[PDB]
Amino acid sequence: MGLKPCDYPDIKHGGLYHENMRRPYFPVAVGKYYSYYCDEHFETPSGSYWDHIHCTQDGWSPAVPCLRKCYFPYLENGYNQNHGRKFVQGKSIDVACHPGYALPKAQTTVTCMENGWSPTPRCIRVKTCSKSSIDIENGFISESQYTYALKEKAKYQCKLGYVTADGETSGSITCGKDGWSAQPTCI
């Protein structure tokens, strides 16, 4: 009898051309295909603003007729190589922020979703702890960098014969939102 038929394609971020003429022939028989467009900021699988949707035995094809098009913005606090490039939905791009800045929080890539970039392509200043605020007697900070990013650890080594609170001859402390995890102890 009938391996039938397909209903009106509710095209997200797009629409069918000649909408008034084609409505109501629906439900539409299999094999029938219609030209459709995609709204601004969106594209067809072929990469154009218009294509053809086909009534398949398993529904409309393509299943996602209109994919988002993402525009890589300028990065004031990062290294720029893609400012102005366009990417189709599902694409992941590497993001290089300047030392001390990171993506939120903290991916190394932004992916183009249907709703736009995920996360937003912008480098935010990372919170830090200063080595100058550290205090240790009978040991020293064996690193030795001045600024530590959140969750980064500051290494310290005790003096000959002294031990930490583990009690080992060396340990570390962690940088947090509230400052250092604690004070190094070498006794």
Ligand SMILES: O=S(=O)(O)OC[C@H]1O[C@@](COS(=O)(=O)O)(O[C@H]2O[C@H](COS(=O)(=O)O)[C@@H](OS(=O)(=O)O)[C@H](OS(=O)(=O)O)[C@H]2OS(=O)(=O)O)[C@@H](OS(=O)(=O)O)[C@@H]1OS(=O)(=O)O
């Ligand atoms: O990343 S952002 O939030 O800054 O948005 C970047 C995109 O802004 C556009 C349009 O975005 S849209 O509204 O989503 O389509 O234009 C806007 O930014 C550009 C400059 O891009 S840059 O990365 O910030 O430098 C401005 O051009 S200019 O002012 O720098 O010469 C647009 O001003 S104008 O409309 O062109 O007058 C500015 O428009 S708006 O003030 O944001 O309304 C895209 O640029 S566009 O595609 O040329 O319009 C940016 O995406 S892009 O991939 O960087 O171009």
Ligand SMILES: [Cl-]
């Ligand atoms: Cl930035």
Ligand SMILES: [Cl-]
């Ligand atoms: Cl010291």
